[PDB]
Paper text:
Escherichia coli bacteriophage T7, a member of Podoviridae, has been used as a model for understanding the DNA packaging mechanism common to tailed phages and related dsDNA viruses. The phages package genomic dsDNA into a round procapsid using the portal in complex with an ATP-dependent terminase complex as the motor. At the beginning of phage infection, the tail is responsible for receptor recognition, and the portal and tail act as a tunnel for DNA delivery into the host cytoplasm. Here, we determined structures of the DNA packaging intermediate and mature capsids of T7 using cryo-electron microscopy (cryo-EM) and symmetry-mismatch reconstruction.
Subsequently, a 7 Å resolution asymmetric reconstruction of the mature phage with a portal-tail complex at one of the 12 icosahedral vertices was obtained using the symmetry-mismatch reconstruction method. The portal-tail complex structure is similar to the previously reported recombinant T7 portal-tail complex structure. The portal-tail complex was reconstructed at the same resolution of 3.8 Å, although the core structure was still smeared. Another two independent local reconstructions focused on the portal and tail, respectively, yield the structures of the portal and tail at the same resolution of 3.8 Å, suggesting that the portal interacts firmly with the tail. Twelve copies of adaptor protein gp11 assemble around the bottom of the portal forming a ring-like structure and serving as the base for the assembly of a hexameric tube consisting of six copies of nozzle protein gp12. The dsDNA is embraced by the 12 tunnel loops in the portal, which have a weaker density probably due to its asymmetric interaction with the dsDNA groove. This dsDNA density terminates abruptly at the interface between the dodecameric ring of gp11 and hexameric nozzle of gp12. Consequently, the terminase complex cleaves the mature DNA genome from the concatemer and disassociates from the portal clip, followed by the association of the tail adaptor and nozzle to complete the phage assembly.
Author numbering:
A (entry chain v): 3 to 57, 60 to 149
B (entry chain v): 250 to 794
C (entry chain u): 349 to 497
D (entry chain w): 349 to 397
Write the structure that this text describes.
Amino acid sequence: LISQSIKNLKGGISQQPDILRYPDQGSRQVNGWSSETEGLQKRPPLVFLNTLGDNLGQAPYIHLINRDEHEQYYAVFTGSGIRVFDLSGNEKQVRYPNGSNYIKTANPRNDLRMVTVADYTFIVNRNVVAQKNTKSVNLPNYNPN
Amino acid sequence: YAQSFSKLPPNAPNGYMVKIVGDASKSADQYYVRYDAERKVWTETLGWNTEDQVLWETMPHALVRAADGNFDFKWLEWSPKSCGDVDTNPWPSFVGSSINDVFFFRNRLGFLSGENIILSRTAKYFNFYPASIANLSDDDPIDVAVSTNRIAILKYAVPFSEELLIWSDEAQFVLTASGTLTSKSVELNLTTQFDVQDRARPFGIGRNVYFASPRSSFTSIHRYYAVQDVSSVKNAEDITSHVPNYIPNGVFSICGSGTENFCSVLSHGDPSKIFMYKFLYLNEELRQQSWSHWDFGENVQVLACQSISSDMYVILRNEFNTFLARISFTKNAIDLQGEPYRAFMDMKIRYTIPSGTYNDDTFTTSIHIPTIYGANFGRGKITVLEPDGKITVFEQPTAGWNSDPWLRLSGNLEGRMVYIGFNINFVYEFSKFLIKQTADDGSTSTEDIGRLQLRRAWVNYENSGTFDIYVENQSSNWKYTMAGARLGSNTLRAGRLNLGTGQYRFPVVGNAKFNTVYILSDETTPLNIIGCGWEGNYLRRSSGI
Amino acid sequence: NDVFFFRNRLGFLSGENIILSRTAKYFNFYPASIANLSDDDPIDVAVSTNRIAILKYAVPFSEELLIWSDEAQFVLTASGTLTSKSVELNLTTQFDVQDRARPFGIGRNVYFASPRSSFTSIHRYYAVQDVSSVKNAEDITSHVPNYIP
Amino acid sequence: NDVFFFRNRLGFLSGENIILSRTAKYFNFYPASIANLSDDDPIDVAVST
């Protein structure tokens, strides 16, 4: 009559068949939090702050900005335009002084980028290609003779 | 057209330009001067026919906080070409193709195209031209293309440990110079050829950087890291090598964090789950693999959570209304002022009850659900928690909650500042309790030769409880429900928490190959599982080896 | 914040900025002459990362000065000698460090203080044995996690 | 045979020859000027075996 104890439960799925897999590895695990000292726990809940919508871009590109402790906002890049929430959940206004013409994309996940430093928050479209403009030259013709 | 700077006319009135050609004594290009005067001076200006600026809206934009409090999405200015002609100033090589994934490699500024690296001049941004073509001074814009033999349209760049490191698919790279950075110094050579799909930016975390790798139709997220023995050789281990078929092959975010030491990858082939990867490193060795759903409901599409230091902020869809949501990894805390008992609800709101809800005819206070929230709900089990020990479970109606959002409790609950949440579904199966034995090397291998008649596995638990246990044979289905503490314990109170401490023994009777023990519960209450044992008769007839 | 002593230069930290002095004399953050860049100029390299790093404490050990923001650590070297065009300033790891206490000593190691809620997770930063210039940060509260308030 | 892409140069292989281009433009296997060897010249190293 034998017996053995599995000391830890860390952790998680192992879709490898059960005569191969290690102990500590369950076959499914939902809402678990395999910590270091304590084993399985429930994941801590979702507080509500607060709400913002009706099912925002249908599939958007969302990337936060984390400048200071008092300065922590989002950036939601919907198919229509830029929308910014804070970290308390209310909307804050953006403005298009130069036209949008750059965020209107069917797939803003696959096509928009955002590189962010404390001085500048770059927003990159990947579909658009950048050309030279033929309007502003130095001299119009200038036959150099 | 003069042949040197010394051979140059004295006055040459104000609207006049000279193409200074090379002296054939220095390695010099052909710069232009343009007397300007009001002051007898030959400067250096732009070419006459070449044009100065880019199309200047198609360039990458930015948003600025500017101190009204509201943002504004603007083009930023781009410094025009003015030092010479084309091509002593060539057009920078993104002028035909698209840009993506802007660097910050130096106090230069970099662009990526396929296949192009376009760095700026140092100490000022958005000036991709030399200051002067009297000579190549230093600190010029840098146009190195790529150094490979296979097509690499050149996506995300991430830095770690020595370098910036510029990930195309099927190539990784090394971005260095030999000494300092000039336009002639930049190395830009290959590292490996691991395949990386480019929809989610590869995140963090510590010494490692975590991929997202494409398959059909189950992704194979790797872990990119510098090896120990060589100085500058990198390797990409799969961390889904034992869980291969699990993530549904569209990856738009990798959230991650460093304080609680876990990676976490959202998916879009099944958007209602947040996958997890809990790990820790001790003595430069992995000691914990983990993969887990977090599940928020039946149809709750999860937008990209991001994690400020120990707070997971999540955005969800319903699909009636979206909302922000915080997950805080605080252990012995209180979410909202006026607990008992931290309540692990899913979707807590301390909703005080207004004056007019009660009617003394039917003796029922009733709560309209989006007057708490602003949102209508698909499904779930809304539980309601009082500052007293009351908990009511409501068990969503057929075609609820949107048909009748109405939360009917009791008679008089107006000033009670009540807590309203959901239930989480906590699920944990076990592996089938075989004889795990770590021999001959490590890599613990089972022995499945004789019939392992299994009996009474046991689960020990730290300071929580009320998980059930479901033991599931082929046709048995026993459920070993459990509650908080033993009778007479100091933990068991006529009102306080009911938590308790292990162990707990419960019969798992039958063959090992057929018994699947698992722990569903529900709840508004935590649990802890420390270890699990089992005993049982083992009899292998054929005495092996 | 968090003034260097990296050379006989003198350094400042801003977000995101490194401001070194001229050599052999302090508090002169300008070149001696702009007849040319001679050598030994003040150095203005900003940062080389893709994530916001307001740039706190700097501590030296074993090869380098080593300039800790939160969520980034760094490497402060040059290729050869130090000019304004020479300074490397590139990433090492991305371990999270709260910046209220200066990370102290001690021998070969440097000890963090890492933020959680609401029990800190003090690490131990050290150079690994096998690589030349790869560092790692083990948790030394990994078995006592819930202890420091 | 077996054309490189080693730099923004362009390379050829012969037996025994390496023929790299000048940088930043392809298909120009000659120096820009013989006022001096400037930099970025075409490269003709044969083999070392």
